Amino acid sequence: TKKRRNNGRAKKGRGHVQPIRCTNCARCVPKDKAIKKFVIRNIVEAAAVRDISEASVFDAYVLPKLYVKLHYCVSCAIHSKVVRNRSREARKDRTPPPR
Amino acid sequence: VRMNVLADALKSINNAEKRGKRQVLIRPCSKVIVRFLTVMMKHGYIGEFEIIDDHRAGKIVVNLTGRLNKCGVISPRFDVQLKDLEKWQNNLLPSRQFGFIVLTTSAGIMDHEEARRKHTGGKILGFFF
Amino acid sequence: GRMHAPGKGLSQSALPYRRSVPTWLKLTSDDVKEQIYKLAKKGLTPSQIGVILRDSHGVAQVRFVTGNKILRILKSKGLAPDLPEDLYHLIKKAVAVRKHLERNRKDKDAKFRLILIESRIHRLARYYKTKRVLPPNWKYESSTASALVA
Amino acid sequence: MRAKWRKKRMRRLKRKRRKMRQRS
Amino acid sequence: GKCRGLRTARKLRSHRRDQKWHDKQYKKAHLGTALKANPFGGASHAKGIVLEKVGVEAKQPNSAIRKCVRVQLIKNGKKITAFVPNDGCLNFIEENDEVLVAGFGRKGHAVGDIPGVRFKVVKVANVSLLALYKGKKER
RNA sequence: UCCAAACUAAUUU
RNA sequence: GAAUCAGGGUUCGAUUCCGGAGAGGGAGCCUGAGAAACGGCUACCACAUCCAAGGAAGGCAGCAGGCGCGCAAAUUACCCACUCCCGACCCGGGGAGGUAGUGACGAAAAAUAACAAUACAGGACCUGUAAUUGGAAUGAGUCCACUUUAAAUCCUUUAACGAGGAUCCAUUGGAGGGCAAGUCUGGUGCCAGCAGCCGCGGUAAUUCCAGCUCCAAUAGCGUAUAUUAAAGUUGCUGCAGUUAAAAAGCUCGUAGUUGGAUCUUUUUACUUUGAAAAAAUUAGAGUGUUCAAAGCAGGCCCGCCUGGAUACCGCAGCUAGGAAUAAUGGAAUAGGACCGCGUGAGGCCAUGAUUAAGAGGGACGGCCGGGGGCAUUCGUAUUGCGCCGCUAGAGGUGAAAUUCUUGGACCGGCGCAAGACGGACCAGAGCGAAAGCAUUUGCCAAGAAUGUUUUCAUUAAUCAAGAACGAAAGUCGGAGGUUCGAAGACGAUCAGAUACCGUCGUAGUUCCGACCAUAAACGAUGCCGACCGGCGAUGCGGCGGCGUUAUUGACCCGCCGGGCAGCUUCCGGGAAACCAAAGUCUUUGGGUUCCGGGGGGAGUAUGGUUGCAAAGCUGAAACUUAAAGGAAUUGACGGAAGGGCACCACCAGGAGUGGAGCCUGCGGCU
Ligand SMILES: [Mg+2]
Ligand SMILES: [Mg+2]
Ligand SMILES: [Mg+2]
Ligand SMILES: [Mg+2]
Ligand SMILES: [Mg+2]
Ligand SMILES: [Mg+2]
Ligand SMILES: [Mg+2]
Ligand SMILES: [Mg+2]
Ligand SMILES: [Mg+2]
Ligand SMILES: [Mg+2]
Ligand SMILES: [Mg+2]
Ligand SMILES: [Mg+2]
Ligand SMILES: [Mg+2]
Ligand SMILES: [Mg+2]
Ligand SMILES: [Mg+2]
Ligand SMILES: [Mg+2]
Ligand SMILES: [Mg+2]
Ligand SMILES: [Mg+2]
Ligand SMILES: [Mg+2]
Ligand SMILES: [Mg+2]
Ligand SMILES: [Mg+2]
Ligand SMILES: [Mg+2]
Ligand SMILES: [Mg+2]
Ligand SMILES: [Mg+2]
Ligand SMILES: [Mg+2]
Ligand SMILES: [Mg+2]
Ligand SMILES: [Zn+2]
């Protein structure tokens, strides 16, 4: 039987979307199917921010960011616990988890 | 495309009946529909209907009393002799007590009880009950 | 819907109810017919004659002023084209695609649209042959059609 | 048996029958 | 759906005549291949000659030995297997003995727990096997 | 993200 | 015509009536009004009969009969008396026909007990039960006679006999469930056996073999096979096709099928009626064959009266009414009706062209789009290479090793080269018939939607045959080869590992030109059309509206139309999951195309066809099997995820046991 109303992907008005590669194992995934995760993790690891900033040659130096857009196949995103399985009524819910 | 105007008229009257609406638009008005509605109106299932003339095939607004169960059409318009008419009666009508099969005979568009009186057959248009 | 497209678009004209000529149009039926005689001398098809009269003269419909359609007025005087205008424009379109297809012959989309356009030509010439507009021996050859248009 | 490979075995068998009848 | 128009009788009659072939009871009663394949040849009974007494093992979960005979027909020379129905009616039959066989219930299909057997013996040497069983007649 | 295969013919609820 | 049958149907019709055909196979003929005759000739083939071997004669698919074939079918009987036929005929002849025999093909009728008293049981004076008793009634059978009939026989009639265990004896199938009827008794012990189907039987068998009881239908009843209903499991009425079997990859397209509105409120189709239609059969009228199946008879006191009906008989053809529906036809180069008048000159017709589809084609307008083709430009990256710098490791994995490195690997810097690829932006957004489509710019042709008081005037919808397109892989030519990488070679892992993981690496991946025609080519959902709830968005076009902002755009608030979607709903539907379509379906009919019929065998075999090949298309059967399957529910389990817990679990430990001798328990041996 059919499990989701879209077929686990966001392809509605087109026939073929181009594929990307999973950043964890390089599986070919269509672009709309893949679990996208944009991370703006700081490059400093704030346990270390009070050591880099005291050792700087500046005083007001805002530390840069790191902009990585990760992609995942369904196999890797479950195994990395990016996503989880949900109940049957709780699948019908598209609001992202809060911050 | 639209091959049959009477079918789209009776399907729209039937859908508005079970929705409980009072009035309904019937798009293109032919004279066969007007002669079909009068037979429904003389036996009293529908109210007065207003015909709108717009210099092409017009529109008909029909008042619904709330009495109609099912107005259906029969496609194609099979020729029906008086010998075979009672076999159409127990395939279309829910009872021998009410309901009508509408024929188009040479003396005009008739219900089936009138065609027995006039002793003539014709092609079948539809039915209502 | 459309004949060779999956378009269901509605979008057409809508003539008003009263077909009486408006009072502000001070222009007789002869003065419109003479006007149509000159615009057709300039080589204009009957579709784009009614556009000029509508946009510049207030004549919303020729057949309400004069009682006759524009193509009936031209056929009565000999200013009618030999081919009908809508068949002329399907043939003129089928030349530009087939000239395009000489040079761009990997263009499989134009090869597809040329089949659709020419299928309309043969459905349309079937109609004008049974209405006795075109002669019954009239065929559409692709190799000789370029001289008939433009 | 994955029916994809049950087709593949049925190709290779039909492959083999064609050249048995070719040589006769 | 289906065509309903007033002149579509040929389309309806021919489509029906083609789609009749897709069920089993019409197909076997009109090809003639299955009529070619049963050894009765469209008959209800046949006389044959017992060649051999054969033991047929029952399909599981049943665990008995079904007593049958290997019979060659007189009509066409086809060799079949017929069941011998009752407690100990194999002892009434000998070899080279002329029997009468009939069908076994399911109109050509195999019946019960006997694999590949679709016939039973009726008369044994012009005497019905039900009479030898009940002691009505003697050989 | 180390390897991890198999399971009376001996039957009765 | 027959069987079945609600309405439709399905199957059968060798078979007594009508018509045809043939007389072992074919062929040729004579005679005659009529024959290509066969109870007529003539051949040849096949077969077969007598024979003195020289010859001669043959045709039972006529009645009987026999052989053979087989599951399968009657007496070498009597008669022209009836029915009729033929002849020269009131007289003769008829294996036509009639009558008997054989006849459980079948159909109709109908015995095998009834009563009374007791013995008893009951019920609110009535009834039941009895191997108790009682004489009353009859046929079966035997049997004179009549009758019957050609002579008989049978039935009908009537004497004579003819019943108590009224022995003058009712069988055939069953008893777990379907499905009416036993948890009785004895035997057997997964044996013998039953059982259509599910099943039963391995030592208390409700199922076998028997006895007892009981049930069913009864002079009938099982069994096999064809077939009809059941079967709305062939679906015209009436089926399905999202996931159960199934909608073709997509579009074009000829046949075919189907086609908008419009007018009095010529050819057809249709409808009604009339004829003409073989009886039998069917329906059905009348009628006490003793009833009934039947039959066409009969009935009423010299005779009389009276029946031997009517209907039905598809379609086609014929006939007269009807003129709605549905086709079709008349006047547009007037070559037109109508009147007059000399091939002319005229009048005259209100002179003659429906509408402009919330059908369609075409023009036009400003747009819009990862649509298409050609060219062009760019971007880092990767790989290689040079040169420089410093170095001893680099790489790779779960861990490793193959591999690469003092000859300088990797890392850094600058530079070059080549070939791919177009990130982020990029969305439940767009475009395309689908496959598919993303750097910049130019060129070429296309197209939807919107706008429109333009144009044509039904030009349309769906479509066998046919046609164009059709990812990937694959094929054949050229070119190119950076990355990746089937096959291949190694390194590991492993019981094995010709796999997963690593290191290399062919074809291929790239382009140009041909092929190939399939995909989970999926929304697993044909197309065209109509109607049927809301709501918030989105994309394009149009229109309107406070105000912001820039020098017609950008925002804002709505409205309209096409589009891709979402949420929500007891519209309704559905086996449900779910769907605003999968709704408007037993209240069953908008048009039309393709296609399914338990699972397997099998998309196999063969044949045809297409292709260079690989293969595509078309496509069985034998045989086999009682399920296979879909949806949902509860458990169980998961080398699935969340929570939580336990020294019969771990951690931190302690004491140990496992080693020794002995004690004692179990296996084994004896
Ligand atoms: Mg795809
Ligand atoms: Mg089309
Ligand atoms: Mg003859
Ligand atoms: Mg013979
Ligand atoms: Mg002869
Ligand atoms: Mg004879
Ligand atoms: Mg018989
Ligand atoms: Mg009987
Ligand atoms: Mg008796
Ligand atoms: Mg039973
Ligand atoms: Mg049936
Ligand atoms: Mg039925
Ligand atoms: Mg079905
Ligand atoms: Mg399926
Ligand atoms: Mg599809
Ligand atoms: Mg019409
Ligand atoms: Mg980019
Ligand atoms: Mg085709
Ligand atoms: Mg390809
Ligand atoms: Mg090559
Ligand atoms: Mg590997
Ligand atoms: Mg390739
Ligand atoms: Mg396919
Ligand atoms: Mg459906
Ligand atoms: Mg239906
Ligand atoms: Mg099947
Ligand atoms: Zn992955």
Side-chain angles (χ1 to χ4, degrees):
Chain A
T1 184
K2 188 188 283 186
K3 193 177 177 180
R4 299 169 176 87
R5 182 182 173 89
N6 62 3
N7 296 115
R9 63 192 296 164
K11 185 179 74 65
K12 289 290 181 181
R14 73 273 304 147
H16 177 263
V17 66
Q18 70 275 16
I20 48 95
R21 307 295 294 272
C22 182
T23 66
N24 200 359
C25 75
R27 181 181 177 91
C28 295
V29 187
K31 187 178 174 181
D32 53 354
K33 192 170 186 68
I35 308 298
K36 296 180 289 295
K37 179 64 73 181
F38 187 68
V39 65
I40 311 171
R41 180 65 67 193
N42 199 357
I43 51 98
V44 197
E45 182 64 29
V49 69
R50 68 176 63 249
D51 290 332
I52 305 298
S53 180
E54 61 92 22
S56 174
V57 304
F58 293 98
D59 290 332
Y61 180 72
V62 181
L63 291 165
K65 297 290 179 66
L66 187 68
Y67 296 89
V68 175
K69 185 179 177 184
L70 289 175
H71 304 283
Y72 289 100
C73 67
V74 177
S75 299
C76 285
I78 292 169
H79 182 72
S80 298
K81 296 184 287 293
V82 174
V83 299
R84 287 177 64 188
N85 56 356
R86 300 167 85 189
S87 176
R88 187 178 64 83
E89 60 94 20
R91 291 164 189 167
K92 296 173 73 174
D93 191 4
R94 296 174 62 86
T95 297
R99 298 292 300 274
Chain B
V1 295
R2 174 181 283 155
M3 302 296 179
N4 194 359
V5 179
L6 181 61
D8 291 332
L10 295 177
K11 186 62 72 176
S12 176
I13 290 173
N14 192 18
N15 284 326
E17 177 69 29
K18 57 178 67 176
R19 293 293 289 156
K21 292 182 180 180
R22 294 293 95 193
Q23 289 178 353
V24 60
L25 284 172
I26 297 303
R27 202 159 65 86
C29 172
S30 65
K31 63 184 177 179
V32 174
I33 290 170
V34 176
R35 294 291 93 193
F36 193 88
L37 296 178
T38 55
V39 179
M40 296 181 74
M41 188 184 68
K42 294 296 179 67
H43 295 289
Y45 292 15
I46 61 170
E48 292 180 352
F49 60 94
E50 180 75 38
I51 297 171
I52 303 166
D53 192 1
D54 56 354
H55 286 164
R56 71 271 294 153
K59 297 178 183 178
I60 298 170
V61 178
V62 180
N63 289 316
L64 293 171
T65 60
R67 290 174 177 176
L68 185 59
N69 286 317
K70 179 74 185 293
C71 56
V73 77
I74 300 299
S75 296
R77 295 175 183 172
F78 294 107
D79 48 351
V80 177
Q81 298 177 356
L82 289 171
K83 274 76 67 179
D84 296 331
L85 187 60
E86 57 94 21
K87 293 178 183 178
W88 290 100
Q89 291 180 0
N90 55 357
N91 288 328
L92 299 178
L93 296 176
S95 176
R96 303 182 68 250
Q97 301 296 324
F98 65 101
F100 293 96
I101 296 170
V102 178
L103 302 173
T104 170
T105 70
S106 302
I109 290 174
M110 299 165 72
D111 53 351
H112 75 279
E113 293 180 355
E114 189 184 358
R116 290 283 180 85
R117 292 194 295 269
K118 203 174 263 77
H119 188 73
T120 177
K123 299 184 184 297
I124 179 173
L125 291 176
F127 61 96
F128 62 96
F129 59 92
Chain C
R2 295 286 81 78
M3 177 169 168
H4 298 301
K8 309 290 187 291
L10 186 61
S11 69
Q12 69 266 21
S13 297
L15 271 74
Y17 182 78
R18 65 263 184 92
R19 61 177 66 94
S20 63
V21 173
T23 309
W24 53 266
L25 182 62
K26 284 92 178 67
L27 190 63
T28 65
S29 69
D30 285 326
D31 298 335
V32 178
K33 287 186 182 182
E34 182 68 32
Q35 190 72 40
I36 292 170
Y37 293 157
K38 295 188 291 178
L39 270 299
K41 284 181 176 69
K42 300 302 291 178
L44 297 176
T45 64
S47 298
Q48 58 190 354
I49 292 169
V51 176
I52 294 170
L53 300 177
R54 184 190 65 187
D55 292 338
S56 297
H57 294 79
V59 181
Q61 289 291 106
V62 172
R63 60 185 291 270
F64 295 159
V65 181
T66 57
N68 286 315
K69 293 182 181 291
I70 293 176
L71 186 62
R72 287 179 181 173
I73 296 172
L74 300 176
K75 288 183 179 181
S76 65
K77 296 297 293 294
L79 282 80
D82 49 356
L83 294 175
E85 57 173 359
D86 50 353
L87 180 60
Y88 180 80
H89 294 90
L90 288 175
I91 294 165
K92 187 179 76 174
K93 186 179 290 293
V95 172
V97 181
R98 194 176 288 277
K99 186 176 77 172
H100 175 74
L101 204 65
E102 294 173 357
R103 297 174 289 174
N104 297 111
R105 80 285 188 279
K106 290 178 70 175
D107 191 358
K108 296 175 183 180
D109 198 3
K111 188 179 177 183
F112 178 72
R113 299 287 171 187
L114 176 58
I115 289 171
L116 299 175
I117 293 167
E118 287 180 351
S119 295
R120 280 193 295 272
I121 290 169
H122 294 289
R123 293 176 71 179
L124 189 57
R126 185 183 299 118
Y127 169 67
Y128 290 110
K129 280 172 69 175
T130 62
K131 301 286 103 177
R132 278 87 65 192
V133 177
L134 295 177
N137 57 359
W138 192 86
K139 289 177 75 71
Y140 169 73
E141 296 88 3
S142 298
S143 62
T144 62
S146 299
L148 275 79
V149 302
Chain D
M1 188 173 178
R2 185 175 172 184
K4 179 171 181 181
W5 313 122
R6 192 179 60 84
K7 178 189 284 190
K8 189 171 183 69
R9 196 167 72 190
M10 185 171 168
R11 297 282 173 85
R12 289 175 177 171
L13 182 61
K14 187 162 74 174
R15 165 78 68 189
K16 192 260 185 295
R17 293 189 177 102
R18 285 200 291 268
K19 72 184 293 182
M20 290 301 291
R21 296 186 64 190
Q22 180 64 41
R23 63 178 293 157
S24 179
Chain E
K2 62 179 74 176
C3 57
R4 297 189 190 276
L6 194 60
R7 294 177 180 90
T8 70
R10 183 185 292 110
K11 179 62 180 288
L12 288 173
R13 191 183 67 186
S14 71
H15 175 76
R16 185 82 273 144
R17 188 179 63 239
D18 298 332
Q19 295 296 324
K20 287 187 181 70
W21 295 102
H22 288 281
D23 56 348
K24 287 179 180 286
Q25 287 85 16
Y26 185 87
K27 190 72 170 292
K28 71 181 289 184
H30 290 86
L31 284 176
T33 307
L35 188 63
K36 191 261 291 180
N38 56 354
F40 286 174
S44 67
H45 286 74
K47 287 172 183 175
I49 300 301
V50 174
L51 298 175
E52 187 186 7
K53 293 182 179 180
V54 65
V56 177
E57 290 81 4
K59 292 172 73 175
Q60 285 176 353
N62 290 323
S63 176
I65 305 300
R66 298 280 177 258
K67 274 79 180 172
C68 299
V69 285
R70 182 64 179 163
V71 176
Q72 179 178 2
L73 294 180
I74 295 169
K75 187 195 290 185
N76 53 5
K78 288 179 170 64
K79 293 182 179 68
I80 62 170
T81 299
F83 178 67
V84 181
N86 278 316
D87 192 357
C89 282
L90 192 65
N91 293 319
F92 295 105
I93 305 170
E94 68 175 5
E95 289 180 351
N96 290 316
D97 195 358
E98 188 268 326
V99 298
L100 180 64
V101 300
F104 192 51
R106 296 181 68 184
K107 284 91 174 66
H109 191 276
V111 178
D113 57 350
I114 314 101
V117 170
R118 63 195 75 248
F119 299 108
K120 67 180 183 295
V121 180
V122 174
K123 291 174 71 176
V124 180
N126 291 319
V127 172
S128 68
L129 191 57
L130 187 143
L132 296 173
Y133 184 73
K134 297 181 184 295
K136 299 292 186 69
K137 294 185 180 68
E138 293 177 351
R139 178 176 295 276

